[PDB]
PDB file of C-alpha atoms and ligand atoms in Angstrom:
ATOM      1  CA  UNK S   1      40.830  -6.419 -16.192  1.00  0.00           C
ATOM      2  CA  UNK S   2      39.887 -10.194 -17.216  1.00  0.00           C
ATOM      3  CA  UNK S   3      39.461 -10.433 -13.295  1.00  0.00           C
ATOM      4  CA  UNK S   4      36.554  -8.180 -13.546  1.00  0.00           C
ATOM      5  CA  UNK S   5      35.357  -9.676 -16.865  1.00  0.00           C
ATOM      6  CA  UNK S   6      34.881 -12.587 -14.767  1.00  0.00           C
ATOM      7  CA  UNK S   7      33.550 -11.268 -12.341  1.00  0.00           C
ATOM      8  CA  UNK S   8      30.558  -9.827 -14.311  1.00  0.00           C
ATOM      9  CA  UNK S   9      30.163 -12.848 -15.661  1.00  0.00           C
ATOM     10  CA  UNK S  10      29.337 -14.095 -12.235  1.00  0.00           C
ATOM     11  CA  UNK S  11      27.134 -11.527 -11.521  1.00  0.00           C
ATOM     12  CA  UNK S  12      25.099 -11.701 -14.936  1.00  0.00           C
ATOM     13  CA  UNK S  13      24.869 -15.801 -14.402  1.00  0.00           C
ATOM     14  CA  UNK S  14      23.470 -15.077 -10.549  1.00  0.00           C
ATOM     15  CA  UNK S  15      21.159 -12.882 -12.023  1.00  0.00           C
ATOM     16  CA  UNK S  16      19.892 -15.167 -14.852  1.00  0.00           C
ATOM     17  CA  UNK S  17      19.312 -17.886 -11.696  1.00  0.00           C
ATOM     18  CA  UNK S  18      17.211 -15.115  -9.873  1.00  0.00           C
ATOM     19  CA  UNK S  19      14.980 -14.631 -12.853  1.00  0.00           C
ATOM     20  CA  UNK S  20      13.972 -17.836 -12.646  1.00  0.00           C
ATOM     21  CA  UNK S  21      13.566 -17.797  -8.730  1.00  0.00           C
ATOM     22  CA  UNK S  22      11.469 -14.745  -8.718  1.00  0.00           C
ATOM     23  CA  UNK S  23       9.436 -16.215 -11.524  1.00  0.00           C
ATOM     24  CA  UNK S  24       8.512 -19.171 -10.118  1.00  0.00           C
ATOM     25  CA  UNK S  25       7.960 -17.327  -6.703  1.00  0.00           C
ATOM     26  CA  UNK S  26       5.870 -14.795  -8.650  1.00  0.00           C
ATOM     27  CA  UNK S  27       3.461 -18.235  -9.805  1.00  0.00           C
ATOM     28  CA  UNK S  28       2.734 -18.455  -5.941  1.00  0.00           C
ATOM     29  CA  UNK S  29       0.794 -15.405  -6.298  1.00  0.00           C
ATOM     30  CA  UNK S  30      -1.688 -15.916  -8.576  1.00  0.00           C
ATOM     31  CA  UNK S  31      -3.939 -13.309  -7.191  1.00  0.00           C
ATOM     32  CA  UNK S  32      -1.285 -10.937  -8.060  1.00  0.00           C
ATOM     33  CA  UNK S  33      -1.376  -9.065  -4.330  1.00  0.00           C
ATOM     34  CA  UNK S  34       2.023  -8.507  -4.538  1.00  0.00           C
ATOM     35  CA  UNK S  35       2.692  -7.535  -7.814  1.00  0.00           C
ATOM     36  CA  UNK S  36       2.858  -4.014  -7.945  1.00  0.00           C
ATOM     37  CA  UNK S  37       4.009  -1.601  -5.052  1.00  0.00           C
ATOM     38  CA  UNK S  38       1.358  -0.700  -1.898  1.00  0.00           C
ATOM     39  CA  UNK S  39      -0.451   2.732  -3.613  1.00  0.00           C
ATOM     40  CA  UNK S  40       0.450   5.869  -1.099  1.00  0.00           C
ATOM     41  CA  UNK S  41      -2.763   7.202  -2.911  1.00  0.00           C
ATOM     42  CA  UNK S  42      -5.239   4.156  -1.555  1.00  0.00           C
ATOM     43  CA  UNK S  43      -3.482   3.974   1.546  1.00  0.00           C
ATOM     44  CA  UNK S  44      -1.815   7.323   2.272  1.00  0.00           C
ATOM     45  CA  UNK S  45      -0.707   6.193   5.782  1.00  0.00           C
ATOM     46  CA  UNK S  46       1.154   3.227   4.711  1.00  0.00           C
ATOM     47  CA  UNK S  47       4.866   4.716   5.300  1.00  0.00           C
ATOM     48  CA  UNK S  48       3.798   5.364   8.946  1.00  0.00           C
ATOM     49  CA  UNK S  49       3.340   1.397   9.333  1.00  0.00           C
ATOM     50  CA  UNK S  50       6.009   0.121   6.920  1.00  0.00           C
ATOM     51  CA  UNK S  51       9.111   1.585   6.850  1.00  0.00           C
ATOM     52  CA  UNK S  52      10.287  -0.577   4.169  1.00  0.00           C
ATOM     53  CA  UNK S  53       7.975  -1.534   1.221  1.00  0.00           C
ATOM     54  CA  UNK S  54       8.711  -3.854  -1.564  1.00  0.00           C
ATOM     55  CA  UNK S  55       6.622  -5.609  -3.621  1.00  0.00           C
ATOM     56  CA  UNK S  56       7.715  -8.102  -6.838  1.00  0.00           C
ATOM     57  CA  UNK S  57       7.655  -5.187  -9.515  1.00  0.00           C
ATOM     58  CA  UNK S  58      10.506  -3.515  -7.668  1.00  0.00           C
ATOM     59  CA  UNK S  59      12.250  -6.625  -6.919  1.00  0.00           C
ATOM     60  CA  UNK S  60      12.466  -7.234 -10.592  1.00  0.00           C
ATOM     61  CA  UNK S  61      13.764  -3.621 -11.411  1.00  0.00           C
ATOM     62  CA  UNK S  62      16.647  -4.384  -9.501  1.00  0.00           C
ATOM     63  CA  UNK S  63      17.262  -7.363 -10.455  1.00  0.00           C
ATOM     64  CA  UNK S  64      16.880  -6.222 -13.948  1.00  0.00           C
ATOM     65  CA  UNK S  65      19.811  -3.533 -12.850  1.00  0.00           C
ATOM     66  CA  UNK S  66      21.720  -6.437 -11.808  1.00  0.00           C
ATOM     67  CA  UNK S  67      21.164  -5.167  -8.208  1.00  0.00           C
ATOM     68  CA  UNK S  68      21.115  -8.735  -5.986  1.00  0.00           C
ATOM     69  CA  UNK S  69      25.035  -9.684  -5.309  1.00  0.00           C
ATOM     70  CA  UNK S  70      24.040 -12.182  -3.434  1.00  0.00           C
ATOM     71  CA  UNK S  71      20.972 -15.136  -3.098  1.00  0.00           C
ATOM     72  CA  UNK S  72      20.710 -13.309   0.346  1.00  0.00           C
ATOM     73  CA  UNK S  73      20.121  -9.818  -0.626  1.00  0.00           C
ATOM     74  CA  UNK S  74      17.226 -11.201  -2.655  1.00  0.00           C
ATOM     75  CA  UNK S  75      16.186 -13.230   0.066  1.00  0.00           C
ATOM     76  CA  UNK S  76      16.006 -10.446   1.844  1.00  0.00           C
ATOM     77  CA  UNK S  77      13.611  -8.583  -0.319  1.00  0.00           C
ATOM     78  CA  UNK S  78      11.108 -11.506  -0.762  1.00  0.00           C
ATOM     79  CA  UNK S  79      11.023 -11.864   3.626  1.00  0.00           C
ATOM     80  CA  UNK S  80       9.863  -7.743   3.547  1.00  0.00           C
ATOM     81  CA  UNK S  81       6.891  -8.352   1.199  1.00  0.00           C
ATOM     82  CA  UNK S  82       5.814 -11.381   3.524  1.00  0.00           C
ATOM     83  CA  UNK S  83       7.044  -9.461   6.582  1.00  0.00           C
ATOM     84  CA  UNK S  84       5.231  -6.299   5.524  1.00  0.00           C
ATOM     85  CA  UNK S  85       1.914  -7.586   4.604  1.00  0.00           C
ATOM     86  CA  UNK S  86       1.476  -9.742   7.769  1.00  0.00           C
ATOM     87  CA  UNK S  87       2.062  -6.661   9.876  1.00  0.00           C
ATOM     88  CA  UNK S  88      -0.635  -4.389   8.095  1.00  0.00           C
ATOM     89  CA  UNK S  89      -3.372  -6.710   7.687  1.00  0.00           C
ATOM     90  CA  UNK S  90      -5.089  -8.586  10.597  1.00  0.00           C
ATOM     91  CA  UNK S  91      -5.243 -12.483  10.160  1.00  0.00           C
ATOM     92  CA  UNK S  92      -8.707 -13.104   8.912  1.00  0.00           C
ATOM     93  CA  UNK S  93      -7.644 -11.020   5.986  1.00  0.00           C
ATOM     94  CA  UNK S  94      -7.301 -12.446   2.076  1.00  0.00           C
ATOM     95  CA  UNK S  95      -3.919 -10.193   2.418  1.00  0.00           C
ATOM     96  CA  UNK S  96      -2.518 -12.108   5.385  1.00  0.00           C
ATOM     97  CA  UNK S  97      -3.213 -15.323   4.255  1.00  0.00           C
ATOM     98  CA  UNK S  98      -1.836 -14.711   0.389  1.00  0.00           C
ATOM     99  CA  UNK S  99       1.137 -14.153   2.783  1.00  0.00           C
ATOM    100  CA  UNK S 100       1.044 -17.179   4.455  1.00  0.00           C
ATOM    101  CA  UNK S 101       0.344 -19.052   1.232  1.00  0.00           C
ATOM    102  CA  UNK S 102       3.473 -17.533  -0.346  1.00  0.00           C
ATOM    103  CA  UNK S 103       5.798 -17.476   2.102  1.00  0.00           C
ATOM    104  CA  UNK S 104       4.891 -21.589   2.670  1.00  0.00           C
ATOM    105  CA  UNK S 105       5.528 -22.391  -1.042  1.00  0.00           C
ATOM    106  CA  UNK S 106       8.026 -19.869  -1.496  1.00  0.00           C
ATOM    107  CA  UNK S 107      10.191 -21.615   0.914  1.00  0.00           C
ATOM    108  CA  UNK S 108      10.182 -24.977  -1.051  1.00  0.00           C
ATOM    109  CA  UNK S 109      11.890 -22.943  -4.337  1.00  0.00           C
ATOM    110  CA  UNK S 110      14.421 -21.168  -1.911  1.00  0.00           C
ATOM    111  CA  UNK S 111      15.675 -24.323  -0.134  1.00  0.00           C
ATOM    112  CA  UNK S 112      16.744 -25.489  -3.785  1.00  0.00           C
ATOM    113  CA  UNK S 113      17.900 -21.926  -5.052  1.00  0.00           C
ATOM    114  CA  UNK S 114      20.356 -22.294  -2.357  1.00  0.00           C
ATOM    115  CA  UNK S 115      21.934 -25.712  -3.216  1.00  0.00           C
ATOM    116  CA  UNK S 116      22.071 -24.125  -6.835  1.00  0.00           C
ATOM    117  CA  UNK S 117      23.974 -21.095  -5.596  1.00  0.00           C
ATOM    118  CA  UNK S 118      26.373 -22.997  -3.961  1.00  0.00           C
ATOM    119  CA  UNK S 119      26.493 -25.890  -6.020  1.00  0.00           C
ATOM    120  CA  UNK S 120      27.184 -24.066  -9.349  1.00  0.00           C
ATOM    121  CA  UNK S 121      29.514 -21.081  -6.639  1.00  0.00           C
ATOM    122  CA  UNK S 122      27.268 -18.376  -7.956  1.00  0.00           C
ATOM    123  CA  UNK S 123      27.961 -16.030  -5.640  1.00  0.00           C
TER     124      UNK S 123
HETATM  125  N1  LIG A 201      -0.148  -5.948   0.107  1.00  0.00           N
HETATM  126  C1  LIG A 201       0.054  -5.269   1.272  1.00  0.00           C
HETATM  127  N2  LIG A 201       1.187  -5.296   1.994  1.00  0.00           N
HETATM  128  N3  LIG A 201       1.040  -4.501   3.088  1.00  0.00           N
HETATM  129  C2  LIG A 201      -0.176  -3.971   3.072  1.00  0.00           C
HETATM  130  C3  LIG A 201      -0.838  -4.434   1.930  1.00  0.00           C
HETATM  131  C4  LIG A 201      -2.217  -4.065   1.540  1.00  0.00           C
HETATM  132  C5  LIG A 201      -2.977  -3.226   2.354  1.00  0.00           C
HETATM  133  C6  LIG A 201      -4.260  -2.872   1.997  1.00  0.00           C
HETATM  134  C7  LIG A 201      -4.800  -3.346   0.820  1.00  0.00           C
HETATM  135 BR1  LIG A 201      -6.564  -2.892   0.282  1.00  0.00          BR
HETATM  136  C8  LIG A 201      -4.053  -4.169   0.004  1.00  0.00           C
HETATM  137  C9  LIG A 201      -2.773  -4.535   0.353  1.00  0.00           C
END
């Protein structure tokens, strides 16, 4: 249907937007802490803390998938690798305070990505 069409459309232009997001959240960690998922192999007890992982390599798969319907679902994702890495590591760690640093500067890009959702109805 052209309904659909549209739809998809939508979906693909939402998705271009969250490149850019995740991009320019990605730049707030430039010692790359949260690039790649926690390694089960370097910390084989990791699922017993954190019962959700995510880290920005698997954020970007499913974006990539066209996976995030919605700026909230992505939103979402971003909060769990702050969320995640402030429970695991103590507060005098370079860990928790990458988190910190992130979550601080992240929130400045978010606050617009919002107005843009809405602005250009993305969503
Ligand atoms: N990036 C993380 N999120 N949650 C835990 C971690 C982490 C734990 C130990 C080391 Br070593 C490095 C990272």
């Amino acid at each position: 249907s052209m309904e659909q069409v549209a739809m998809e459309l939508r979906l693909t232009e939402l998705t271009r937007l969250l490149r850019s997001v995740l991009d320019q959240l990605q730049d707030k960690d430039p010692a790359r802490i949260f690039a790649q998922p926690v390694s089960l192999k370097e910390v084989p007890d990791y699922l017993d803390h954190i019962k959700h992982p995510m880290d920005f390599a698997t954020m970007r798969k499913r974006l990539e998938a066209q996976g995030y319907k919605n700026l909230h679902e992505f939103e979402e994702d971003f909060d769990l690798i702050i969320d995640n890495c402030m429970k695991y590591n103590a507060r005098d760690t370079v860990f928790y305070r990458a988190a910190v640093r992130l979550r601080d500067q992240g929130g400045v890009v978010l606050r617009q990505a919002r107005r843009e959702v809405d602005s250009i109805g993305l969503e």
